[PDB]
Amino acid sequence: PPGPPGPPGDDGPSGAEGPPGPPGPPG
Amino acid sequence: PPGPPGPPGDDGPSGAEGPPGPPGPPG
Amino acid sequence: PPGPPGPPGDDGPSGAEGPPGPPGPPG
16 A cells, blocks of 8 residues: 655745846936 | 655746836936 | 655746836936
8 A cells, every 4th residue: 555645845936036127218 | 655756846936026227328 | 655745846937027227317
């Protein structure tokens, strides 16, 4: 009689920080 | 025998908001 | 005995794009 499956894995790491925004308005 | 490994974890959470974009064209 | 835990999940999605940059320098 084999054991039950192990616990579900942890959630992965957080994704990277988002890319920079669009360029600002003209001065 | 031991049970098999558990189900794979979910994807991680979303990253933080990106930084501000480049400064606009000069006046 | 129970199995090993599942592998940790994938890296999450990227954070949202940043806000628009600061306005350009003055003329």
